[PDB]
């Protein structure tokens, strides 16, 4: 009998996949769950289910966390007065703006169809403002810039794939989570393009 399978099938993978974020915490919690499960067979499953039953609360929070990811945070802001750099600041502003409003448009087919078109445009236009700004840096010193462009392109694909799954699923949290990652990424674009400049 395995009332204990979910420890290994859910919790272990969950901790394993969070090791790069923090290692020690992943380890201490694994150990905590293992000890709890051995003293109390079936406890991990009961815990997992009680988390899954809080789906509403967790959706509401993830919405808030996304809505808040936008507003101009006093850190990432390129000081350079050049037109190319300024165009970058604002195209990122527009993308972060549009991605942050997803929570309040997703529950309407028509409006969300418009939003998807605008997000696509906002991404493309940011890609243009990143491409236009390359010339401002010494061409033998763009490793970080190029690398950060690729990573942004990866997470943009990732968001597009997430958005594709939504129409088959209907599960909005994936979209929200993916959209928040993308915001974090456009921030890293701003961070990278500010450090080399």
């Amino acid at each position: 009998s395995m009332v204990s399978m979910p420890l290994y099938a859910v919790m272990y993978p969950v901790f394993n996949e969070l090791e790069r974020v923090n290692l020690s915490a992943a380890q201490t919690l694994r150990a905590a769950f293992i000890k709890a499960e051995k003293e109390n067979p079936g406890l991990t499953q009961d815990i997992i289910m009680k988390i899954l039953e809080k789906k509403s609360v967790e959706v509401n929070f993830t919405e808030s966390l996304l809505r808040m990811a936008a507003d101009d945070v006093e850190e990432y802001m390129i000081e350079r007065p050049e037109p190319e750099f300024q165009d970058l600041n604002e195209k990122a502003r527009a993308l972060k703006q549009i991605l942050s409003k997803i929570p309040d448009e997703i529950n309407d087919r028509v409006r969300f169809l418009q939003t998807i078109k605008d997000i696509a445009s906002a991404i493309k236009e940011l890609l243009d403002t990143v491409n236009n700004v390359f010339k401002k840096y010494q061409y033998q010193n763009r490793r970080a810039l190029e690398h950060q462009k690729k990573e942004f392109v990866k997470y943009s694909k990732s968001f597009s794939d997430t958005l594709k799954t939504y129409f088959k699923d209907g599960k909005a949290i994936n979209v929200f989570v993916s959209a928040n990652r993308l915001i974090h990424q456009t921030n890293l674009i701003l961070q990278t393009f500010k450090t080399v400049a």
Partner: peptide
């Protein structure tokens, strides 16, 4: 169509 339009410009 807009779903594919993103992937093309990203690739």
């Amino acid at each position: 169509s807009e779903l594919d339009r993103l992937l093309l410009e990203l690739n």
